[PDB]
């Protein structure tokens, strides 16, 4: 398998439609061993998490904790066992509270809200890398989840903002990572159906939200050469994989578009 | 003059190297009429810009503060006279704690250092925009300043985060400002020897990072193909000016790169 | 006047709705004294210019053609009186053989066609560089027209790739400029209603072609937070005098978007 | 291993430190069963390859010959059985004229020298996807060589400007190998010592142009976080394996950068 050997944390399931939980289970395909990480619902992270191909250790991860980042290290060495090392580190965290995406005006999100988001999805992939690369093997991968936030879009928002600020952060974990031999990359996706896609899209950030997204989603498919399946995170899941792999090792602070072409096309 | 008749807000002056004091005096020398905006040494503020060319009142402004941007608008109004509005708005604002740059390591800056800084020079932006939009007039331009983040470097580190989310935020604030028939555009300029900066260079946020600026300084002249004055604001202020004026009127959501054209070459 | 007391050269008057004849009827509203180039057509040209507010002297110039470029500066040097240099050098010059654009096959455009169109469109704007920069004073700038090439679009095809030539060719011109005190950079235009961009959108290429060019105009105008107006040139005129002017005198190599802000806005 | 079963072409071996030379032998370690191209000198070519893991057929291609491009389908099938198609192409190809690079004044390139260089670095892309798309599986993979060219640099002048129009063409083949289910990308490689640049670096392009290559390879490996090796082109190899592969199925009109992530710092 291209991850032969391969010890790898996986955190961001949450749902069977989660973008994390497909990485996981071509990561196992492909012969990682893996180490999970959940935020707050630990039960139903462990249920999702009995339908990946081989069973994984579930260590509990919420990246505001400061006490979680700090014995993150010592709980993933005692699940993989002491002189055992990770090769790779899955970030795949988003968040953003309801003031900042969708029909809520961009000018009307409190910056408690905003910076709440920034936190979750931007800085913590610096606290995730600061927790991890002491625990890390020369040759190592972090990888982020990202969307192409170059150009505003709407409904987005302060999601967008949280992107652009992400982007910015993978290039400075880069700096601190290769002290490690390590490799730090994101993979800027197309969108996906995840629950919550589904649920903006039918409508619960507002309608006039649900339908920018619905066209933003047939546009996306329309300007990709190759098209796009919103339902189908598989070739994002192998894409992650291929940063995890060793067969990208002159690439880092970088970004790995795996939208099926559409930013590289205008119409 | 190139500003004529319009009547303009100007922020972020608080001593005679602020880049807002020489937007200011350049603006004034092309006929504007100004408004500013000071933060917390207001009596320092005042002796300052009793320098320049023309007196212009003075506003409070603490962009962390919802009163003091609650009450803005109706402030401006007063001070410019009832029935009159803006035609310009420079945003001249910019702040990161002392753990989010120079030598202090990227992944040693707390969250709660990096959420204000990210609040002060990306976040109120927006809050500005927010405050502003009501009483501007269509034609009308709001500018802000930015350092080129699109690649990451030494000691600038998260104030680099904050100028990428910044640009994000710029991108937002052109959709909703041209609602109102207005332009939002940044100026990435070049470094400028400003009084912190002068300290920085001097060694404020230790040694290594003061080094590395110096020599960043350096090579900015070397790779410009028209050379930059990092002692020499003026340039900065009249690409400023130019945005504010009626000669750009279809830019709006982009960066004017006022750098001596630096960022365009690799050596 | 913005361009009081300027030397200006402008290339490419063709028709009436030429970008060249507006940004020649702006520049001389606001007091620059201009040489005009024109290809094939002089009498054309020359009855076309004569709608210009002020008279102007018509120089013959085809860029394809060595002797041309080799005399330029001795016959420009002739127009403005000895002693005199240019201040200003727009080149509006753009041209890409049938076959390599509209229905006609990416993959069906002989060599010959495209070379020529990238010797037109690219390579001529260093030729106009390297006959003018002799004759150009310090301070001076240098103004080619753009059309954004960062991403593919149907239709436009082989000119897309010349543009993305362009961009680059501008970046070496900057280089070579700066030994002058000389300013090189681009304006990059939202689509325009010239008298060929009608014929192609009416169909002159092909149905296909002309229905995508159609759809891509009615895009533009929707992304555009300030909105696009395909049949007036005055805009990007004012863009590329604001360039000529001394209100951007720290941006070379570089490209300014008069498009409506439509490049910074996915939907 | 990665391309086990898999048919690929690959073009530009011409010594033992091409690029190419380590494409081919990464590939063959990996499973894939390769066709090659040669230029000009077939019994050198031929010679070289007996190094390789594999033994492959060689088959003559100059891309400006147009019998060579019509016949090269055709004489492909021939080599790899009748009913066998393609999985992967890569093209390897890169020449401009002394006149367009090195010491030589940039505005002293005749176009007839910089038109030949293009045909060869650029146009040949969409020549070779011609030829080949039309033999070639769905879930196939067309791979280019680049040298970010988004920012003027000393020396490499005219070949800079060659790679620029290269990425515009890969935009523009990802849309036509799209309707074959094929993929089309770039890899962006730091520099390599070749023969050719290990020479041009030794002053067979003038000195000052070997000195400015020289500080351009040692500022390279300073600015990547994870270092470059110049010496190494294994990197690369791995690099665009993992775009042949399935690994990376989402990924089109796009560039990977194989360069240390060099061009994502500043400094
Ligand atoms: N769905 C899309 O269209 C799309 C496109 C591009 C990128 N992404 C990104 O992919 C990543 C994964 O998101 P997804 O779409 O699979 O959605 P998701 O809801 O399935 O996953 C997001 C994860 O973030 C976790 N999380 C939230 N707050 C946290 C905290 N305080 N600590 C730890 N974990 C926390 C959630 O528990 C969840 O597992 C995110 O970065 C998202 O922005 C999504
Ligand atoms: N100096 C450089 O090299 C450089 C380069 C590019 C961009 N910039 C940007 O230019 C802008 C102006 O900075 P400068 O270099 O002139 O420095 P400066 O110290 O003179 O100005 C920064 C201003 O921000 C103001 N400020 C800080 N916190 C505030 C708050 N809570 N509310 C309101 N105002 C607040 C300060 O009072 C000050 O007037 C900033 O956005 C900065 O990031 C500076
Ligand atoms: N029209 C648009 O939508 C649009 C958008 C962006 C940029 N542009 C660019 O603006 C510039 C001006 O074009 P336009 O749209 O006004 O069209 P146009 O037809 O009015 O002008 C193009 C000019 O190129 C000249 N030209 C062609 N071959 C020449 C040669 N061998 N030597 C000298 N001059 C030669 C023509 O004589 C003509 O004056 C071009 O670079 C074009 O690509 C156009
Ligand atoms: N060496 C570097 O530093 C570097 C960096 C980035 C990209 N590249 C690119 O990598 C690719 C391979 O070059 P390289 O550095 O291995 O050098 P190289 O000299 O080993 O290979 C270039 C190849 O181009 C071939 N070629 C030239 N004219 C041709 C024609 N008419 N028809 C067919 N083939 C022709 C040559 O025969 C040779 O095999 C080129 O695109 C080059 O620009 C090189
Ligand atoms: O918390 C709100 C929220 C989180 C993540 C997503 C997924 N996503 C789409 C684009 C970027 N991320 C969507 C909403
Ligand atoms: O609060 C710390 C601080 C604020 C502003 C500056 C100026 N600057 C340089 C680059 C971007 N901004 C520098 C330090
Ligand atoms: O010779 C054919 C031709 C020349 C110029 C134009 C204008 N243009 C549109 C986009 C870029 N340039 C269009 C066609
Ligand atoms: O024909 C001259 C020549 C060809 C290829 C190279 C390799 N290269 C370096 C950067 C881009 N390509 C160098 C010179």
Request: charged share 20%.
């Amino acid at each position: 398998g291209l991850l032969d050997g391969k010890r790898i944390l996986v955190s961001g399931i949450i749902t069977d439609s989660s973008i994390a939980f497909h990485i996981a289970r071509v990561a196992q395909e492909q012969g990682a061993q893996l180490v999970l990480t959940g935020f707050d619902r630990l039960r139903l992270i462990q249920r999702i998490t009995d339908r990946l191909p081989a069973k994984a250790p579930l260590l509990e991860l919420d990246v505001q904790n400061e006490e979680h980042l700090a014995s993150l290290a010592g709980r993933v060495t005692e699940a993989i066992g002491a002189g055992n090392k990770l090769d790779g580190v899955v970030h795949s965290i988003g968040f953003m509270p309801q003031t900042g995406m969708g029909i809520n005006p961009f000018f009307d999100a409190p910056y408690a809200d905003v910076s709440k988001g920034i936190h979750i999805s931007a800085y913590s992939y610096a606290s995730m890398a600061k927790a991890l690369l002491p625990i890390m093997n020369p040759g190592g991968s972090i990888v982020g989840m990202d969307f192409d936030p170059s150009r505003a879009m709407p409904a987005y928002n302060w999601m967008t903002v949280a992107k652009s600020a992400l982007e910015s952060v993978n290039r400075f974990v880069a700096r601190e990572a290769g002290k490690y031999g390590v490799r730090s990359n994101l993979v800027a996706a197309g969108p996906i159906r995840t629950l919550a896609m589904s649920a903006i899209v039918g409508g619960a950030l507002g309608e006039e939200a649900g339908a920018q997204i619905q066209l933003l989603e047939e546009g996306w498919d329309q300007r990709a050469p190759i098209g796009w399946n919103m339902k189908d995170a598989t070739p994002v899941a192998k894409t992650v994989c291929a940063l995890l792999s060793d067969w990208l090792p002159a690439t880092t602070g970088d970004i790995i578009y795996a939208d099926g072409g559409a930013h590289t096309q205008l119409l």
